[PDB]
């Protein structure tokens, strides 16, 4: 109950934040959310490969 503003700290949530930084990168993301025992875990992969 300690912090005042509570919608979701999307940036304070993440442990490892090393996303592929581009405009055409493709991703996919998996989740496990209980909310009864509290546990939540998220995992997203992203990639890109081009040629010219």
């Amino acid at each position: 109950g300690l912090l005042a503003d509570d919608e979701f700290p999307v940036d304070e949530f993440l442990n490892v934040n090393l996303a592929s930084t581009s405009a055409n990168a493709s991703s996919i993301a998996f989740q496990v959310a209980k909310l009864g025992s509290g546990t939540l875990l998220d995992l997203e992969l992203s990639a890109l490969q081009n040629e010219s």
Binding site: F8, V10, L14, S27, I28, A29, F30, Q31, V32, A33, K34, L35, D42, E44
Partner: protein, 52 residues
């Protein structure tokens, strides 16, 4: 001996130009969104946080 009538010449230039061009592009846009009960699959982390 000098002053005599001279000849006349007709000169005609011709400039020709021809251009051609071709272009082709193909693209794809797809997405998925699914939930299972404490399990989800999406295309980002904000996506999984929204379908909750």
């Amino acid at each position: 001996s000098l002053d005599i009538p001279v000849k006349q010449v007709q000169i005609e230039a011709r400039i020709v130009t021809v251009k051609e061009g071709n272009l082709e592009e193909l693209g794809v846009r797809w997405g998925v969104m699914s939930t299972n009960g404490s399990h989800s699959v999406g295309g980002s982390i904000e996506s999984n946080l929204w379908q909750k």
